[PDB]
Every structure is written in structure tokens, then in C-alpha cells.
Amino acid sequence: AVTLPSHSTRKLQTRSQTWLESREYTKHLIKVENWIFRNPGFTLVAVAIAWLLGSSTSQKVIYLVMILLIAPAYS
Amino acid sequence: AVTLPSHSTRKLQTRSQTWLESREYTKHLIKVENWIFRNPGFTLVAVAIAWLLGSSTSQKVIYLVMILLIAPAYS
Amino acid sequence: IRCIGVSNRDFVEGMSGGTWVDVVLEHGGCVTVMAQDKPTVDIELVTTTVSNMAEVRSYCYEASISDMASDSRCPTQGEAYLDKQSDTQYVCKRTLVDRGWGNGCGLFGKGSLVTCAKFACSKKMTGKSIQPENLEYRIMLSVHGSQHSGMIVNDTGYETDENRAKVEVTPNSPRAEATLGGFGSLGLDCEPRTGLDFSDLYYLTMNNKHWLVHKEWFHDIPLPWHAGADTGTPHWNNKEALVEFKDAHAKRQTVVVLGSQEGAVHTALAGALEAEMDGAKGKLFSGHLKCRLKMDKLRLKGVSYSLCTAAFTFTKIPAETLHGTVTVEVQYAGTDGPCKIPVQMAVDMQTLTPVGRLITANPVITESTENSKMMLELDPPFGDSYIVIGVGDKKITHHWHRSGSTIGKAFEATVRGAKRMAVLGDTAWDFGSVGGVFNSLGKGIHQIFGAAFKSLFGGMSWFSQILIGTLLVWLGLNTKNGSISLTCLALGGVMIFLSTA
Amino acid sequence: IRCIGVSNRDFVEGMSGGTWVDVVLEHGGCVTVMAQDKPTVDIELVTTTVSNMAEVRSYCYEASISDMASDSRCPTQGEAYLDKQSDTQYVCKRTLVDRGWGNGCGLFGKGSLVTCAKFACSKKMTGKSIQPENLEYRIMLSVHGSQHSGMIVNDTGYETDENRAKVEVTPNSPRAEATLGGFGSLGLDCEPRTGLDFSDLYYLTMNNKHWLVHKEWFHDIPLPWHAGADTGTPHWNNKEALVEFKDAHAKRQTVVVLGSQEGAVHTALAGALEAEMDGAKGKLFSGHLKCRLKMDKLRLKGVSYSLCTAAFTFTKIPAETLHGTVTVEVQYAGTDGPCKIPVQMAVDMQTLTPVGRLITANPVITESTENSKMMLELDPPFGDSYIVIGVGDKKITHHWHRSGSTIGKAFEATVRGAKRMAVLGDTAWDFGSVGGVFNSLGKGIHQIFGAAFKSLFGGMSWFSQILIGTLLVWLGLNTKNGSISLTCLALGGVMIFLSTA
């Protein structure tokens, strides 16, 4: 019961709003900012890996963003 | 609400079992496999974005993995 | 009438020589179909009633464990066994515990321990399937004419009104005709099967709150489910998704149940349409129909009447209905009988040149008492102008100023059309269409793109769409090649698709 | 005794000339401290009792809304207002609804609507703070000696036994001494403050199930909370995290409450230590102490006794306690009184050369009746060997075969030490230490690495640790530079840290 699959992928598109639509834009941003606020050192260990992986300058930034998105969800 | 923060980040490391230990290994894998099996079309989108963002044939694989992980969790 | 205050009204004007026009009735949106010489009729889809639903699963979102027992074997003596282990109501788990001379055994090593515990469910949610031969859309019609303010939302009495008539459209009887006395009869050639795609929707029901969940989502929930309409004691496949067996270190294994997953699944829907229920039938209030309006016997009642003499008087000073149109209510003081109102709009009152069209076609007074109210609706020109209602010197006037511009009109209509195309998707090409090689070929190209886009991305939420949209627009502004319009159109189709919600 | 069947026993042998030895008592793990000339004593930490906890918050995980009301204003007439809006028990929300001539208004536009609804909570979870002057560790001791099988887990009677004694160690009285009659008294110079770091732990309590949540986690839950120990009607800050206001399209705004978040928070802990409670005190069963064993007055009782004459007999044929050690139980048939057992292990019985050490130091018979049982414990050599118990020709023998090798011994001990270092972390350098420039400098270097690692990563779960570990090992096998051992040691410290759980 720990893996309830979210139904926001199969969003039914109509005029009226869906079940929880007001509480849907700031659902992932809050989960990400709380983790970044509680664990700041991971910002540094993510910048390090991004800079060690991305050959370009706009490639290491993408690596950094994707690491800071994968970390606070663990998947 | 909808943004309950997980304690597996701050799990208390002792000799005994934590709260839900048996369910902690095959949880994110279950979610990822479920989402990918439900939406198979996105695999080729991830392939086409990785195989176009990456320069070496081992940054394309890392990009493909990180995209196929960011998608089933939405950041 | 019935559609004059709605904030999502669309005007569909023009047909194929007077034959028909296609419309897409949505829930919450009204349609005003004004023709060349036919009365203006207002069509609105009110409810969608799904009936005769048969259930498929029943997940148990709040369980409880009764009497629990255990059994232990010494090391190298087999493994433990309970008599209540062959019972399909008990969830059990075997593990190895340390066993020694102190635990009453006779050999040191990992023993064996089996813990049984009776699974009894208290609450459950049932998911019923929807078959498209059960939808029954109800469509309420209303013609602009002999109606005053007390006729707009007033639903008390329709089939004795000559102006309001409800139509129920089932895939068993798709084409139905509404009898509007004196005006003729509007024909609706609906499409009640290609609605909201009810072949992949279910009907959740969790503690007197019903939803419209997707089939794929409903078949992936990790909770103890059983097979069907069992009202007794079900079998509860997959009991181990709510119990948790914990061994401390020693010959001990505790079994505890997870709490009520009601809130955990409430925050897990987060995309499902909320529906209701009035007994055995499930009444939806969101969706859309696809209708064709055969308008050939909708005749204009009162074209042979005589004009009014005099004594018109404004009551309920005019107003502006969020779109520019003006709702005027007049009160003819006279006993002429069934006469015709001489309404028009005019710039400077010397020539009285008409400048704006009239939304209500051929207004007419029918009540023959001395104080007979009537409600019009005009469409003024951009700028200041007068509303002349009458003939002679006892005509009443009213200064009106419609703030806006034709460029604003065009941009507003473009935003309206873009929202309709992001909501309806493919069927948005059948909203005012009369047939052609554009409103029928463009629909094919849009259908191809829609299939290849709902199968390609088709599985992202609002946030992830924003994310991949920014990623693709940045892949467009770089990597100069022929595959750049491809990664910029896939920025548009991902920002406007969501970011217009 | 008391530690002979445990699967996580550690042998701590050797001290600083007989003075003391440091040990780290964990919950679930036993320690057998064998000295040079002193009796073998078994130390085990049993419970940790936290008392006098004062609560901080109380989240409400299952709410309900009573009477709800609303109020609406016409467009350009201000905004709506309810008398029950200045009440701090009602959760309200204002929105704009469409308003026209049909809704009884007099002007078309977006009106104003306020919906109030009374918030009444039914269930809540309280989080109490833990102060380190409240921990009270209980330590049970047991010496190998005049004890048979019925003395291992048998806790009925300790303070009349001369062999079992409990010690309660509080940060108010850290050093306590256990009286073992005849053997002397073992001294424990504990460290009851640097335990499981109770300065960042709370004590959740949700429907008679208590946990040990982290402080940071407990301060981030999004649920309606109040300030403290309120038993009446609290204030419930942040009510809007359980109600949901939905406007359909028209002058309507429904308010519905989300269900019981009990399951949603049960699956949200997933890393918290489960505790219990026996009233006002919270009894933990996981953690660790840090103890120093002053062993200077632990004397060997029965070193001046006379040997046994004859008539020994095996009962409870020997066994192997998961580590190689052999638990022998004998039965001396004689009335010699307090004599001494002549036990030894020997290869081929001609020379009777001793080959294995004895875990129980100086076994002795004290019971002076004719059938006095006693339980030893030996540590055989690798390979086959005999267990000779007696002198003369009436000595009993038993063939024993200890399967293994010294290389397997060393690898097993290395895996044991690695697991202890991954669990305890820094304090793993104080497990058998007697002081030095290695077990005191290596601890400093390990402490530096531990701080710089728990502050750097410190926030990843098992899966994410595996992920970043693979990423870092691949960054190590490529990008040849001096920063490659740095990204491979950060592969080890992330795979063995988890992947040994």
C-alpha cells in the first residue's frame, strides 16, 4: 500500500477542474524545496558530479538540474 | 495533505528493523516499472532526447536513465 | 434566455444554406445558434446519466487483524505449521528466529516461526464499469422570444412554455427532436457514443463519494481486492498489502496492520472527475456531446405581425453580459396584442442608420395585457451608440458604450478557440463546421497528430509537461538542424496544452 | 549464560593489563568479556526507558466539517461576508462566481462568494520531546559458572543468584557497579548521554502505536496542528490542509474534507524506529550504549578448590552455537562438594595435549548433592578433536568436528566488523579498545569523515544511495585524474553503508 499509483498521469481533460487541481501546481515544488532546504550539502555534491560529467557548459547545468530532481524523489 | 515528507531520508540507523523495512527495497522499482509498462511510448522519447543531448555514448546512457527516472516521479 | 449570463457562451452563426450546423455541447458551456432567418435558440447540455453499472473489483482500504497465533520448531526439525495456515482468511508469514538451550530447544541455530493473523476488512471501495449503451445525455433548449427575466434559470415548467424543451439523447435513440410550439422543432443528430470515451473509465465509490477513475489506474492500486459483487465475506486476494510482519531479533514476530488508506488514496486520485449518484444511476456533470442541428423546420414565429404603436418603457436598465452583448428588458404599455417590437441601434439620431446586429431575432410582444414585459439582447458596435426602441416621437433611447476593439475581438476569439482546442482536442474542429475541405481535412491531420501525441507523451502531468517543454524549447533554440521546428512545435503542444488550465 | 544462543554475540578478550576494556552494548547484541584470569561475564543491554516527555505539537490526521454556510454579493458591490468568518473555528474561502439577471442580481459580471465550514477534528497524533536526562538504560549481566541450562533466559530471580544482576544507568548516575556474590563486582563506567542522539528525536503517538520520529521530519508534516498539551478544543493552525474548496462553474462552491491520513502517514514514516510505552515512560528496544568495564575487583571464585574424583556423565549432547563454540552440559555424580571440573579438549588421546581455549573460565561444581548439573562452553580447534571431561579412566569423551578454517574465521570477523562500523559509525572504534594511538587516532579520522559525510550526503535513502554509488563508481572508472580515488572511496562509503542492511 506504499506504492499508490498517482492518477494525475491519466488526467481527464474537461472544462470543470479535476479532483485536486488547486493543490497540483505546488505539489512537487514543495517536496523538492523541503528536501533542498533540509539537505543543503547535496547541492554541493550535485554540482561536483554535474561538473565532472557535463563536457559542455549547458550540459553540466542539465545534469545538475536532473540530479536535484532525482534526489528528492529517490526515483 | 499531499506533500507528506518521507522519513527514509533520515532513517535511524540501528541494529533493529525500521518501521517499513521489507517494503523499502521494491518500492521505487515497483513504481518505475508500473509507470513504464503503462506508458511504453515515452521510452523512445527518452531515447531520442538522450541520444540527442549526450555527446559520448556513455553520457547518452546516463541521460536516458535519469530521464526514465525523472518521468515516473515527476521531479 | 438560459444562456445569457453564462461566462462560457459561444455564438455559432451561419449554416450550409439553412440546412444544419455542427456543435459540440460541453458541460458548463452554452451555445447560441443564430441563423439567417430563424429564431435564435440556446442549447445547453445539463446532465449525463450513466445507468446499470456492474462492479469489477473492491479494494479494502481499512483492515483489522483479529486473533493471531504462532508456532516454532527447533533447529533442524522441519519448519513450523499452524492449523490455521490452510485457511484463506488468515495472512501468515514464516521466518527464522534464533533458538537455543534457553528457549527450551536442544540445538543452537536458526529455528522456524510462522505467525498467522485473521484478516477482516471494515471499509472498501467498489469500482463499477461503464458501458456506452448506458449514457443518457439531457439537453435543455431555449429560444429567444416571448420571455422576460423570470425565464432564464427558472426551470419550473418547460413542456407548457413553447420556449423551453429538454431532450434526452441515448445511443439507442441518437436523433431526437424538440417541440417548440410556434417556432417549429429543432432536430439534433447527436453522437452519444464518441463522448468522454467511457470505454476506459470506471466509477469509484469510497465512503459516499464517487469519482470517475481511469481503468488503468484502477487496475494498479496495491490494496487487498476481491473479485466482484460479494456482499458476504469475500476472499481478499493480496492480503499482505496491508499487514506488516516485524521480527524484533529473538523468537518474536509481531503483526500490525497499516491504518486507513482513505486519505492516501484521496490524495492519489488528484486527477479524477468527481461525479455523483442519485440511486442506481450515476449522474456526471462534466464531459461533452457532439451534436448536429437540423434546423430546416425551425420557423420564425411572428414575422407577419404588425408593428407597435407607442409607449415603451425601460425596466431593469440594460447590462453587459461579459461579451459585449446587451440585455435589454422593455415593458410595452398597450393593448395592441401580438405586435412586433421595432428595436434597433443607431449612431447620431438624425439618420438612424443601423450599426449592430441583433442576437434575439425578430423580437415580438405576445401578451395582450397592458403591462407586458419582454427581454431582448443586442450586439452593439464598438464605441458609443444609442439603443432606439420604438417608432415616432415616443421612442425611448439609451446611451451605450461598448469598450473594446475589433483587434481585441479577434484576439479574444483566438484565445477562446485555443482553449477549446486544448480541452476537446480533435472534436474542436466540429464546433461551427458546415463541412468542407478544411474543417474535414484539418480534422484528419489534427487526429493524426493527436494520436501520435497522446501515444507518445500521453502520460505526463502538469509539472512534468512544463519541465519537458522547457527542455524541448531549449533543444530548439540550440542544435541548429532541420529537427528544430520539430522540437519547438513540441514545445507549443506541451505549453499551451497545459498552461491553459 | 544469557548470551549463548544469541546470533549476534561478540567476544571481547584482552584488557590493559587487567584494568578495563571498552565495549559498545547494542540492543539485540550480546557481549562476552573474557579476561586473563577473571570469570567470563556476559553483558547485554535490554531496555531503554525514556520518561517524563513533554509534547510539542499535535497534528490532526482525520477531520470533519459540520454546518457550512455561504454568502454572495452582486458584482461591483464589495465582497461577501459571513458572521462566522471572524470565528477561528471555521475555515473559509472567497472566490468569484458568475452573476447575472437570472441569479437575482442586477448587473452581469463576476460576483463574490465566501464559504465557511466548521472544522472539528476527531483523531490526532502527539509528538513528545525527549530530553537526555531522562534515558535510563537497563543492563543485565551474567557470569559463566555454577549455572545449568535452566539459567539462560530464565529471568525469574536474579538478585538471589550470585550470577545475574541488572544495572540501571542514568546520565545522573553513569557509573554503577553490579554485585556478583563470590565473583566480586563488575564496574561499568557508561556513557548514557552519547547514545542514539536523542536531541533530534521525538516520540510520535498515533492511535496506540508509538514511533521515534526525527525532529526535522516531524516539523514538516502538512496537517492541521496546534500548539501543545491542549485537551479541550484546540486552535488548529493551518486548517486548510485537509479541506478542499471546489467551485463547479456557477454560483456554487462545495467544501469537502480529505479522508483519514492515518495510512498516508504510516507509509510516510517508513524509516522510524518503532517503540512502545508502559504508561508514562517510553520503552525503546533499539539503540546502543557505550560502556567501559572496570574489572579490577572481578575475582575468580573457586580457584582454590580441589579436583573432581570421577563419575561425570553427558546430558544434553553438545551443540554448536553458530560461532564454533560448543555448549556442553555435564552431570557430576558424587558428593565431593564444591569441587572443580577438569575439562579440556585434545587431539589423539595418547598425549592429551590441549588445543582449544575455554570460553567459561574455571568451571566449578558447587552443588553438593549427588546429581548436580553444570553447563560449560568451549572453543574447539579447527578440525576434529575430542572433549575430555574427567581424570583417570572413568573420563568421558566426545568426538567433535568444527567445520571451518582460520581464513574463514578472519573473513567472518572482518564482515562482522564492517557491519558494526556501518551501524555504529564512529563509536565502532571503541568496541574492544584499551586505548592507544590507533584506536584513538583512527577514531578521530573516522569522526572527521563521518561528519563530512553525514553533512554532505546525509539525506539519501537506500535506493538513491545505490544510484549515486553506481554513478560515482562509473565516474571513477573514467575521467583519469587524481580525483578518482575520491570518487571510488565515495563508492565504497555508499555501497557498504547501504547494501549491508
TrEMBL record, chains A, B:
<feature type="transmembrane region" description="Helical">
    <location>
        <begin position="35"/>
        <end position="54"/>
    </location>
</feature>
<protein>
    <recommendedName>
        <fullName>Genome polyprotein</fullName>
    </recommendedName>
</protein>
<comment type="function">
    <text>May play a role in virus budding. Exerts cytotoxic effects by activating a mitochondrial apoptotic pathway through M ectodomain. May display a viroporin activity.</text>
</comment>
<comment type="function">
    <text>Inhibits RNA silencing by interfering with host Dicer.</text>
</comment>
<feature type="transmembrane region" description="Helical">
    <location>
        <begin position="60"/>
        <end position="75"/>
    </location>
</feature>
<comment type="subunit">
    <text>Homodimer; in the endoplasmic reticulum and Golgi. Interacts with host TYRO3, AXL and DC-SIGN proteins. Interacts with non-structural protein 2A. Interacts with host HAVCR1; this interaction likely mediates virus attachment to host cell. Interacts with host NCAM1. Interacts with host HSPA5. Interacts with Aedes aegypti SRPN25, APY and venom allergen-1 salivary proteins; the interactions do not affect Zika virus replication in human endothelial cells and keratinocytes.</text>
</comment>
<comment type="subunit">
    <text>Interacts with the structural protein prM/E complex, and the NS2B/NS3 protease complex.</text>
</comment>
From TrEMBL, chains C, D:
<comment type="subunit">
    <text>May interact with host ANKLE2; the interaction may cause defects in brain development, such as microcephaly. May interact with host SRPRA and SEC61G.</text>
</comment>
<feature type="disulfide bond">
    <location>
        <begin position="74"/>
        <end position="105"/>
    </location>
</feature>
<protein>
    <recommendedName>
        <fullName>Genome polyprotein</fullName>
    </recommendedName>
</protein>
<comment type="function">
    <text>May play a role in virus budding. Exerts cytotoxic effects by activating a mitochondrial apoptotic pathway through M ectodomain. May display a viroporin activity.</text>
</comment>
<feature type="disulfide bond">
    <location>
        <begin position="190"/>
        <end position="291"/>
    </location>
</feature>
<feature type="disulfide bond">
    <location>
        <begin position="3"/>
        <end position="30"/>
    </location>
</feature>
<feature type="transmembrane region" description="Helical">
    <location>
        <begin position="456"/>
        <end position="477"/>
    </location>
</feature>
<feature type="disulfide bond">
    <location>
        <begin position="308"/>
        <end position="339"/>
    </location>
</feature>
<comment type="subunit">
    <text>Forms a heterodimer with NS2B. Interacts with NS4B. Interacts with unphosphorylated RNA-directed RNA polymerase NS5; this interaction stimulates RNA-directed RNA polymerase NS5 guanylyltransferase activity. Interacts with non-structural protein 2A. Interacts with host SHFL; this interaction promotes NS3 degradation via a lysosome-dependent pathway. Interacts with host CEP63; this interaction disorganizes the centrosome and inhibits host innate immune response.</text>
</comment>
<feature type="transmembrane region" description="Helical">
    <location>
        <begin position="483"/>
        <end position="501"/>
    </location>
</feature>
<feature type="disulfide bond">
    <location>
        <begin position="92"/>
        <end position="121"/>
    </location>
</feature>
<comment type="function">
    <text>Plays a role in the inhibition of host RLR-induced interferon-beta activation by targeting TANK-binding kinase 1/TBK1. In addition, recruits the host deubiquitinase USP8 to cleave 'Lys-11'-linked polyubiquitin chains from caspase-1/CASP1 thus inhibiting its proteasomal degradation. In turn, stabilized CASP1 promotes cleavage of cGAS, which inhibits its ability to recognize mitochondrial DNA release and initiate type I interferon signaling.</text>
</comment>
<feature type="disulfide bond">
    <location>
        <begin position="60"/>
        <end position="116"/>
    </location>
</feature>
